[PDB]
Amino acid sequence: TSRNSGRDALKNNILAARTLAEMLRSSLGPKGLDKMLIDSFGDVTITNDGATIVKEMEIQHPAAKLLVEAAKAQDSEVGDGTTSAVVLAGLFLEKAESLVDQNIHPTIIIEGFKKAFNKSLELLPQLATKVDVSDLNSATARDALKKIVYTTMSSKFMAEGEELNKIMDIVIDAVTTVAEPLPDGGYNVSLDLIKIDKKKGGTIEDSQLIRGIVLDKEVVHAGMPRRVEKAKIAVLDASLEVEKPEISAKISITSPDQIKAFLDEEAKYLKDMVDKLASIGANVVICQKGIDDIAQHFLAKRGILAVRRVKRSDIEKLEKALGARIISSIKDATPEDLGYAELVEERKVGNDKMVFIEGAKNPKAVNILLRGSNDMALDEAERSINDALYSLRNILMEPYIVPGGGAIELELSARLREYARSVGGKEQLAIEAYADALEEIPMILAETAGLEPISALMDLRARHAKGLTNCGVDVINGKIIDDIYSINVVEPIRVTRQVLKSATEAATSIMKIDDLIAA
Template sequence: LAELVVDAVLSVAEDVDGKLKVDLDNIKLEKKKGESIDETQLIHGVVLDKEIVHPGMPKRIEDAKIAILDCPLEIEKTEITAKINITSPEQMKKFLDEEASMLKAMVDKIVESGANFVVVQKGIDDIAQHYLAKKGIAAVRRAKRSDIELLAKASGARIVTNVEDLTPADLGYAKLVEERRVGKDKMVFIEGCKNPKAVTILIRGGSDRFVDEAERSLHDAKCVVRNVIQDPWLVAGGGAPEIEISMRLKEYARGFSGREQLAIMKFAEALEEIPLTLAENSGLDPVDIIVELRAAHTKGEKNTGINVFTGKVTDMLKEGIVEPAIVKKQAIKSATEAAIALLKIDDIIAAAAPKKEKEEKRGPESEGLGMAE
C-alpha cells in the first residue's frame, strides 16, 4: 500500500507560495469488506457508498454536470399541525395531483439548470425519482455531509440549500459518473473531476476488523508522507538520533557543575528510553543493545540503530529505515513541554472521596458502635 499512499498524497499536494502543502481531508478513505487487501485501489475522484436511487435512471454518465443539494426533493411537513378533511375521491385526487405538481416543479428546476447527476444530502420522494428517471437524470440520496463537501471541492459545484435557487453556475463537472458493484454492494464512482485535488482510497479486506486496521494504517501512512512533503528532511530510525543526542548531551553536561549538570544528564538518559523500549518490544536484551549502540556511536557511526526485523544493530540509512525529522523534533519538544508543565506544579489539592465511598467505609464501624451501645 506504500506506493498507493504516496501517489494519493502527491495527487492532492498544492504549491502555496513556493512550498508544497497537503490537505489530508482531500484524501477520502472508503472501506468495503470483501476481496483481499491487494484489491485496494486509488481512485482519482470521489467514491460514494450509495447507489442510484431508481432502476430507470442511467448507471453511467459521461461529461456529468453535477448538482449538489442540501435540501430534500420531497414535500416537507408544515411546522403547524393541521388536519385536512377529505369528503370525496375528487378531493383526494386534487390533493395528490397538487403534491405531484410541486415535486415536478422541483425536478423541472433541475432540468432547467442542465444537470444530469444530482447528489442530495436528504431524501428524494418516489414521485420525484420517477420524474428524474424520465428526464434521464441520475440521483443519489442521503449522502454524508463530508462526501458532498469533498465532491463540491472536486467538481467545482456549489452546495445549494434550496432547489429553487439552482442555476447552471452552481453545477460541477466530472468526466465520468458510474455505478459499479463492489463486493455485494453498489457504489457510485465520480472520476475526472474539474479539480483533481481530491482522491479516494477504496480499502478492501476479508473482514471488518482487517479493513478497520488497514484504514488506521493508511491514515498513519498518509500523515507520514504529508509530513515528509511539507518538511523534506529525514533522519535515521531505530533509535539512532536519540542515542546520538544523548551522548552529545552527556559531553555537553561536563561543562556544567551542580544541578545544571544533573538536569542535562537526566535529559540525556530520558532520550535513551526510546531505543530501550524499542529493544524490549522487539524481544531483545535492552542492556546489550544500549551498550552496543553506545559503542558504535562512540566510533562516529551516528546512523547506527536497531533493526527490529533482523534484531541487529546496523546502519539505518543503508537499511532504508528512516523517519521524518519533523516528527522527531515535535516528539522531543512535546515531551519537554509536558515535563516543564509538571515541574511548575507547586501544590496538589487532593479531591475528597465520593459520598458513597465514605458511607461504605463508615458502615461497618457504625454498626459495631451501635452493637456496643
C-alpha cells in the same frame, strides 16, 4: 475533607503519570503486548494502540486525565508516536523527581529541561538528514519517501509484507500527486479530503484510484438512468420533499376525492422542484436529504440520475473535486453551482452497487478503491494505507528524515554531556539528567523485543564512541546493527520533534502544578 500541601500532591501526580506511562510502555515497541478492554455493554476490545487503550478506559486519577489529552492531539499526527510520547513524558518526570530529591527546585528543573530542549532543537537540523523538496515531480526514483512509508509499515505490523508495500507505495505516490509545493519547500497535504473505500472479492493488486468521488448510496428508483456521460452534477443541500406553510391546519377526511386533490397539489409542488433542476441543465443530482417518491418519478421522466442520503463528509469532497458549490434553494434554481465530471455510473463492486463520478480537472479530493479477499486482509490494508499517509504527511511537510531510537538519541546524550560541562550552576544537573533520560530510550526498544537492555545500551555507547554514531538495532533480525539509515530504517523528523515537544510540555506541567480543591 482531604487537604494537601507540601510537595504531597506532586508525589501523587508523579505517581499517577508514572503508573499510566509504565503500563502503556509494555504495549510500546513493535514486538510489545496488547491489552484487553471490556465495555459497559460487554463489548471486548484488544489493541496495543495506546491512544485507543486510554480511550477504551475510564480514567480515575486527575494527573492521568491531563496526560491523555496530550496523547489525543498527538494521535491525529502519529498513531505510534503518541504511545512513545507518553512513556517519554514518564521517563522525563522520574529524572525531575531525582533532581527534586537533590533539592534543585521545580522552577530551576523546568528551566534546565527547556534549555536542554533548546540545544536539542539546534542539534535536530545538523544531525538530521534533509532529502530536499523534489525528486523529479515529488516521487521519482522515490527512495527517501519510499523508505519512511516502508519503515513505518514494517514497525507497525512486523514480519514480511513486500507484496503489500508496493501497492501502498503506488497508492501513496498517487496521493502525493494531489498535494503541491511551496517556496517553504513542503507540500499542501490534505488527508481530510482523501477518501478510501474497501470492497470484498478481489486482491490487493486490484486496488485503483478514482479522479472523482465514489458514492455508496442508492439511485433508488427503477426508471432512473444508471450511467451518464459528460455529466453536469447538482449537489443539493435542501430536501426534495415539500415544505408546510407558516401557519396552518389539518382535519380528518373520508370523502376521497379531496385527498386525491391534496396529493395532486403536492405533486405539482414536486414537479416544480424537478423542473428547476432540469432548467439548470442538470444530468446528475445528488441530494443530502431525502427525495420523495413522486419527485423520483419526475427525475427519471426528465432522464436524470438522482442519489439520496449522501453523508456530510462525501458532500465537502464532492464539492472540492467537481466544482458543484451546492444549491441552497430549489426555487432559486441556482445556475452556476453545477459541477463537472467526465462520466458518472452505478457499477456493482463486491456485488454492492456503487455510483462512481470520475474524470475531474485538478481535484484536491480523490477516492481510492481498496479490494482484497474477505474482510480481515482489507481492514488491515486500509490501516496500512492510513499509517503510510500519516507518515507521508510528515515527510511532505518537512523533507528532513532521521532514524528513530538508535542514533540521534545517543548523539544528543553525548553532545549534552559536553554542553552541561560549559553550563554552570544547578542548571548543569538538569542538563545531565535530561541526557540520562535520552539513554532510557534505546535500551527499552531492545527490551520490548526481548533482548538484554543494559548490555545493549553499553554496547551502543561503546560502538558509537570507538566506531560511529549511526548505529541502531534491527528489531526484525533482533540484533545490534551498524549504520541504521544504511539498513534503510528511518522516520520523518516531525515525529521526533513533536514527541520530544509533548514530552517536555506535559512533564513541565506536572512539575508546575501544586494545590487541589475539589467540590
